[PDB]
Ligand binder design. Structure first.
Ligand SMILES: CCCCCC/C=C/CCCCCCCC(=O)OC[C@H](COP(=O)([O-])OCC[N+](C)(C)C)OC(=O)CCCCCCCCCCCCCCCCC
Ligand SMILES: CCCCCC/C=C/CCCCCCCC(=O)OC[C@H](COP(=O)([O-])OCC[N+](C)(C)C)OC(=O)CCCCCCCCCCCCCCCCC
Lengths: 269, 289
């Protein structure tokens, strides 16, 4: 039910994004000893690229329908998106935290990359258990619902026969609210760390505009995509295109604000 | 309908909170010319307290059941919740923005003139966004109280079952659109508030600096909003639980915000009242990172 032209346009855009991701990964894995790239924690950024490619793969996985294994498909793509945005937004807050600590606590007077990776791993483990409880307690079982409903609002009586087919959990709002809440608290502390590391250093090493535009875009994208997924599900081309577009714009935007200053500073050196 | 003991304890707690708010209002009006209250923004504290009493009245109206036009009662409780939240979280952000501009514009001459009328204008713009969103919600898709009886014959992967579900809910037809809109606008506002709390993290003493109150309030706001949305959506067979949880969440959030705003002012009011020999008595209030 998906038009081939829309599918091709989306796949080409996501392939261009993935090629840019691979180019960034090669740049940050080759120029490790360069002063500019080493100043911006090159070993942490590999986690960001892995999260970015995971999100792009999930955006691809939104592009297939029509298989009784749709449930596994939706669970894999949603869990992949969750783990991907977790891995994207981990190291940015970690770098901001380390920059704040070396700016503040060094004045009265050192954090290694392993400590920030441990914080990132704890955050991923939280995401893993929060997804495991969802996939174990109530699955995303697809059911064919046929029902007749009588509408009596107190002034008129009418009857409606609805045959609605959808794929959703028994209590989907609990899981979306809890994942929303955990990610929102994370983005709130990220905005706090962005404020703390405000006008502290150069944008190649100071991640303040990057995290702010990423948090704002993540909030607006999540709201818009949840709205267009819940209500206008009878517009499958629109839902697929908007979901893939939101994921592509977000992932590319954060990755570009992370790595464009690095390449700009490397061009002059 | 609702249990009388829970209604009594909720009303008692909200009355105690409202009397606390009126006491803070009396202190702000009385000692407005005290040096540390003047170094805070008492006029903006008036707006914060007005939002606080609006959301306390919202929590009061959450208990009004089996009386009405209940569809209008839902509108008039949620609208005043949203307006009160705007009026509470506006002036704090304005004060933090003034602190950031005062302490990070260290240029000779060119002194910053940010009068209180500018910040009341910013709060008015935020409230204008609030009222246009609420007007669109009440005009396009109003909440209607509808009772529907229905039967559903669902089929699973291998089994067929039939359920006769009859329910009565009073909710919008496009409810999640309005929830996403208003929670999203509030979310952008509170994320910019977290940014301002970060920027002004070590800018002054806790009487003037509002980093901790912004961070605590924003975390409690997200937690309360998520929990109350879930328990309102999925627990209609437990009216006492949802009423108590909503009232307690509103009371806890508003009381912690107002206590965080006003308790250090009351603590440090004495130290800048009688002697006031030099401005060296307020040296931590001129601090910087
Ligand atoms: C770093 C760049 C990444 C940014 C990308 C952010 C965009 C996310 C949009 C994708 C999610 C939309 C999918 C809608 C749910 C769905 O598929 O339906 C199945 C169902 C919801 O069904 P439903 O409600 O959509 O339709 C049924 C309607 N009915 C009335 C019948 C119930 O989902 C669930 O079962 C619950 C599981 C939750 C999955 C976790 C969400 C993943 C989101 C990834 C972003 C994480 C961080 C953002 C959090 C907030 C940030 C502040
Ligand atoms: C400064 C401290 C303030 C603390 C207050 C924070 C707590 C807020 C709890 C709000 C409780 C909502 C009550 C739901 C009533 C209801 O059922 O209406 C029916 C509908 C939804 O119905 P329903 O889903 O709840 O039940 C019917 C179930 N059924 C499946 C059949 C639909 O709600 C709406 O339509 C609301 C439209 C939007 C109005 C916005 C309300 C204002 C919210 C508070 C101000 C914003 C502050 C929070 C933002 C923070 C962001 C993280």
């Amino acid at each position: 039910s998906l038009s081939p032209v829309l599918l091709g346009i989306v796949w080409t855009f996501l392939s261009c994004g993935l090629l840019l991701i691979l180019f960034f990964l090669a740049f940050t894995i080759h120029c490790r000893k360069n002063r500019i790239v080493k100043m911006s924690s090159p070993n942490l950024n590999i986690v960001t690229l892995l999260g970015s490619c995971l999100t792009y793969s999930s955006a691809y996985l939104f592009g297939i329908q029509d298989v009784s294994s749709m449930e596994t498909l939706i669970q894999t793509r949603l869990s992949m998106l969750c783990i991907g945005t977790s891995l994207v937004f981990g190291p940015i807050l970690g770098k901001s935290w380390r920059l704040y600590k070396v700016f503040t606590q060094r004045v009265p007077d050192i954090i290694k990359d392993l400590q920030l990776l441990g914080l990132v791993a704890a955050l991923l483990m939280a995401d893993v258990i929060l997804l495991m409880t969802w996939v174990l307690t109530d699955p995303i079982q697809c059911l064919q619902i046929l029902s007749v409903s009588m509408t009596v609002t107190g002034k008129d009586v009418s009857c409606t026969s609805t045959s609605t087919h959808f794929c959703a959990s028994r209590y989907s709002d609990v899981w979306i609210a809890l994942i929303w809440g955990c990610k929102g608290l994370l983005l709130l502390y990220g905005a706090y760390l962005a404020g703390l590391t405000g006008h502290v250093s150069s944008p190649p090493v100071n991640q303040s505009l990057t995290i702010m535009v990423g948090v704002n875009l993540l909030v607006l994208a999540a709201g818009l995509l949840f709205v267009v997924t819940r209500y206008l599900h009878s517009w499958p081309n629109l839902v697929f295109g908007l979901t893939s577009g939101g994921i592509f714009v977000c992932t590319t935007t954060i990755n570009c604000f992370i790595f464009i200053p690095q390449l700009k500073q490397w061009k002059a050196f």
